[PDB]
């Protein structure tokens, strides 16, 4: 798609018309558009930092900047093949955003498959409003999950209570586990209490599941009989 | 050259070949001893 001249040069085209006398009366938008000009400078702008990491895009490590011996003990005395190629496309193609937390997230859900079954609302509430002190895991607006663990790990890393990342992660995991156990106990005891004081639940979860299975089975059975009849004949 | 245009050339070439075939004995006579 070619860069369209005629979408942004509107006021100029109308100004010409007004000058001529093709237009008797000025549009409502004319003064407003004059006041607030369009961009009209549709450039490819280069980028020098990856925002997520903070790696430098533009720079090249020199031969003089690498004085000491390489892996396999060879001193770099020349530019290599890649150091001669003009790496301009890297300045322009947008950076792949990388986070240390992503790896931790991946690890957590590998270690805890059934944490995936806990449903996750992705529809954000005000991201600016929140204010979580990761001294502890249990934040108010946020629920208990692997995310909270990871945030705790990051906090530990920052504060240097656990200098190592792995140890901090383990600690966060252990904090999480206790909380989870407590949550589990809460629900069961609440259920027990309800049972004791004459509460009545019409459909339990397992009963519901059985009912759901039953309809499917009924559907299958009629179909299966028809298929058997088909096969016979 | 389209195929149609080529066909005129082909025809010409065929005619030439025919002429050569006709004038073989005559050509032989002309060639030897002069």
């Amino acid at each position: 798609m070619k860069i369209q001249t005629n979408a942004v040069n509107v006021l100029q085209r109308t100004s010409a018309y007004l000058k001529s006398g093709l237009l008797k009366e000025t549009p409502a938008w004319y003064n407003v558009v004059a006041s607030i000009p369009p961009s009209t400078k549709f450039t490819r702008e280069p980028r020098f930092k990856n925002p997520s990491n903070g790696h430098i895009i533009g720079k090249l490590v020199d031969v003089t900047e690498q004085p000491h011996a390489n892996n396999k003990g060879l001193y770099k005395t020349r530019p290599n093949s890649s150091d001669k190629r003009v790496g301009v496309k890297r300045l322009y193609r947008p950076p792949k955003l990388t986070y240390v937390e992503d790896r931790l997230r991946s690890l957590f859900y590998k270690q805890h498959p059934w944490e995936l079954s806990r449903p996750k609302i992705l529809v954000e509430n005000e991201i600016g409003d929140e204010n979580y002190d990761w001294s502890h895991m249990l934040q108010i607006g946020r629920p208990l999950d692997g995310e909270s663990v990871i945030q705790r790990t990051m906090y530990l890393i920052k504060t240097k209570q656990y200098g190592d990342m792995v140890e901090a992660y383990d600690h966060a995991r252990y904090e999480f586990y206790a909380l989870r156990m407590q949550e589990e106990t809460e629900q069961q005891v609440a259920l027990e209490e309800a049972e004791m004081f004459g509460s009545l639940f019409g459909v339990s979860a397992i009963e519901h599941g059985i009912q759901k299975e039953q309809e499917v089975l009924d559907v299958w059975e009629k179909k299966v009989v028809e298929e058997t009849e088909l096969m016979a004949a | 050259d389209s195929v149609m245009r080529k066909r005129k050339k082909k025809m010409k070439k065929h005619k030439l070949r025919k002429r050569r075939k006709r004038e073989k004995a005559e050509r032989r006579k002309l060639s030897q001893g002069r």
Partner: protein, 87 residues
Amino acid sequence: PPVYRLPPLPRLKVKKPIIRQEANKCLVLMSNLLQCWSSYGHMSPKCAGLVTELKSCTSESALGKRKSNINYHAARLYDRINGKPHD
């Protein structure tokens, strides 16, 4: 595995969408009867009810009972589902 991307086509459509219906009941009964008559001689009373059932089925007409919108979806969704590069 080996993916196969098509070129830009004029119109994605199947030329004959099958709407694989179930086979006819009357025909089935007739086949069953035929199978029974292969055994048990010509017309023994093992297939006494089967013949009656067939007759009941094929009383009003020779067959008892008398399309898939598939190329209404292909046509709809071709432009989306393309990996056609931008304009």
